[PDB]
Amino acid sequence: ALSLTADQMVSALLDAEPPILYSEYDRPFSEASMMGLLTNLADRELVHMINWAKRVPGFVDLTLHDQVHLLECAWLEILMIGLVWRSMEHPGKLLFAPNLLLDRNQGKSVEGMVEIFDMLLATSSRFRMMNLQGEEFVCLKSIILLNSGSLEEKDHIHRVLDKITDTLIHLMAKAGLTLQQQHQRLAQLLLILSHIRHMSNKGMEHLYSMKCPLSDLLLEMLDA
Amino acid sequence: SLALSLTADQMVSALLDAEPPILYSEYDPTRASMMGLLTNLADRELVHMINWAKRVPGFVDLTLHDQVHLLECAWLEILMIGLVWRSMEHPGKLLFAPNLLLDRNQGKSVEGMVEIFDMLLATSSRFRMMNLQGEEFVCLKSIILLNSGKDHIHRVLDKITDTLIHLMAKAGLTLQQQHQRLAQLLLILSHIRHMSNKGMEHLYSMKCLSDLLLEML
Ligand SMILES: */C(=C/C(=O)N(C)C)CNCCOc1ccc(Oc2c(-c3ccc(O)cc3)sc3cc(O)ccc23)cc1
Numbered sequence: 369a370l371s372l373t374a375d376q377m378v379s380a381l382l383d384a385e386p387p388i389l390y391s392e393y394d395r396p397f398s399e400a401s402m403m404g405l406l407t408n409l410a411d412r413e414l415v416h417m418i419n420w421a422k423r424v425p426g427f428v429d430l431t432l433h434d435q436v437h438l439l440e441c442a443w444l445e446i447l448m449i450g451l452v453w454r455s456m457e458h459p460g461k462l463l464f465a466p467n468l469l470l471d472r473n474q475g476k477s478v479e480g481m482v483e484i485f486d487m488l489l490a491t492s493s494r495f496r497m498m499n500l501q502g503e504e505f506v507c508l509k510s511i512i513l514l515n516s517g518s519l520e521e522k523d524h525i526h527r528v529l530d531k532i533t534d535t536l537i538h539l540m541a542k543a544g545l546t547l548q549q550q551h552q553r554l555a556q557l558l559l560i561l562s563h564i565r566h567m568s569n570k571g572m573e574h575l576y577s578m579k580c581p582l583s584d585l586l587l588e589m590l591d592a
Numbered sequence: 593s594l595a596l597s598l599t600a601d602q603m604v605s606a607l608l609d610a611e612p613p614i615l616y617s618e619y620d621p622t623r624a625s626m627m628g629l630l631t632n633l634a635d636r637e638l639v640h641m642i643n644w645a646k647r648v649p650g651f652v653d654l655t656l657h658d659q660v661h662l663l664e665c666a667w668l669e670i671l672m673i674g675l676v677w678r679s680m681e682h683p684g685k686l687l688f689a690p691n692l693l694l695d696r697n698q699g700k701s702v703e704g705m706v707e708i709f710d711m712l713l714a715t716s717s718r719f720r721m722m723n724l725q726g727e728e729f730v731c732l733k734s735i736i737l738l739n740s741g742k743d744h745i746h747r748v749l750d751k752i753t754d755t756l757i758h759l760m761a762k763a764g765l766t767l768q769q770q771h772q773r774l775a776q777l778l779l780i781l782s783h784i785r786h787m788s789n790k791g792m793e794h795l796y797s798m799k800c801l802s803d804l805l806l807e808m809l
């Protein structure tokens with residue numbers, strides 16, 4: 369994994385992308401039926417996210433305890449960044465699934481969600497204005513998984529992280545940006561990870577306030 | 593502006609000169625009440641934080657409403673990064689003030705703090721094993737201010753990015769090492785944002801600014 373070239377790192381991440389799932393086909397929504405649809409969608413996406421995580425270069429080198437801890441810390445950030453990527457070409461709307469395209473006005477169905485919704489819409493628009501590319505997106509998504517959670521494991525994680533930084537830079541140079549523009553865009557992209565982490569923390573708090581484990585799914589699949 | 597015309601060295605020099613002082617916890621030897629000391633220290637530090645923010649290049653160009661909003665979102669993040677900077681050379685301890693240096697054991701007195709306490713220590717040791725430099729620290733603190741929560745904001749952030757790269761180049765880092773270190777520092781920013789969100793949560797569970805921000809700004 370540390371032996372990969374930038375081009376191999378990009379290609380591995382693109383081939384590892386999870387599928388776009390559909391919402392259940394179950395009518396103005398109520399708080400219970402909207403959260404029921406989103407929970408059921410999140411639960412099904414989580415299985416594919418575990419398969420994706422196992423293919424992120426360096427992830428399966430970790431102990432099985434750390435693989436679980438990283439997924440436990442990152443899963444909502446990863447769901448959210450997938451959501452904001454999918455929503456880029458739908459201004460004013462969040463594409464939870466191709467059959468579950470919601471505007472902020474539907475977010476009010478759930479008490480405490482419309483504000484986290486607005487952050488997601490704002491982040492989506494920022495990705496649009498930055499012209500975020502899919503190859504950059506898979507790098508950021510990978511960074512989120514490795515960064516969100518043995519001193520040797522930490523060290524190993526950092527080397528993969530450095531490799532992904534090199535890959536991001538390599539992509540920007542290969543696209544013809546100047547070195548100044550390369551370092552600037554790299555910063556702009558990483559600073560958005562701060563916003564995604566914040567939205568995840570607000571989301572986790574919102575979810576804890578509602579009646580509802582991931583731990584069992586992680587362990588079953590990770591060991592599998 | 594003049595802020596957008598600054599060189600990397602002027603940006604560093606301005607930020608170094610705007611650094612607030614390290615305040616001390618009040619001395620009441622016969623006075624748990626650990627939170628009282630931390631709140632009083634935090635309140636006095638905020639006053640200097642507002643004065644510092646006004647000297648971050650490009651900050652006073654914003655409207656008063658945005659200046660207020662950035663400080664309201666960033667203040668605990670700024671407090672925390674100052675804390676981890678001060679604690680770098682005290683492994684296992686958080687130097688809230690020179691006379692209030694606590695270890696984990698002392699942190700466990702406050703219910704709800706020990707989780708965030710361990711995260712603060714981990715960030716400090718990480719800053720310690722990257723040998724974070726004081727000029728890098730002031731740039732990171734500025735980024736936190738501007739990134740907290742406009743095109744002008746984006747341009748100053750580009751300038752601080754350029755300044756950070758300049759510092760690493762002048763320190764002899766290779767270009768590959770320059771972009772790697774730049775990524776490492778900014779990724780630590782998301783942990784600081786994380787620690788701040790948990791801290792607001794912890795603080796909100798204990799009963800105990802907008803008007804102070806408006807008065808000073
Ligand atoms: C059971 C317990 C529980 O939540 N805790 C904390 C113990 C519920 N199972 C956890 C997963 O539940 C969900 C339900 C709904 C979503 O929606 C969702 C996003 C989101 C969540 C919360 C707020 O306030 C705003 C947005 S983002 C996103 C992206 C995606 O691809 C699919 C769903 C989704 C997540 C998890």
Ligand SMILES: */C(=C/C(=O)N(C)C)CNCCOc1ccc(Oc2c(-c3ccc(O)cc3)sc3cc(O)ccc23)cc1
Nearest residue numbers: 630631633634637671672674675704705708791794795800
């Ligand atoms: C009223 C309401 C309210 O908002 N709160 C938060 C009580 C008054 N607000 C005044 C701000 O209050 C404080 C009190 C104590 C600290 O301690 C502190 C840090 C910290 C706090 C909580 C957790 O869970 C972890 C760490 S970090 C840090 C750094 C520093 O230089 C000075 C104090 C300090 C902060 C704000």
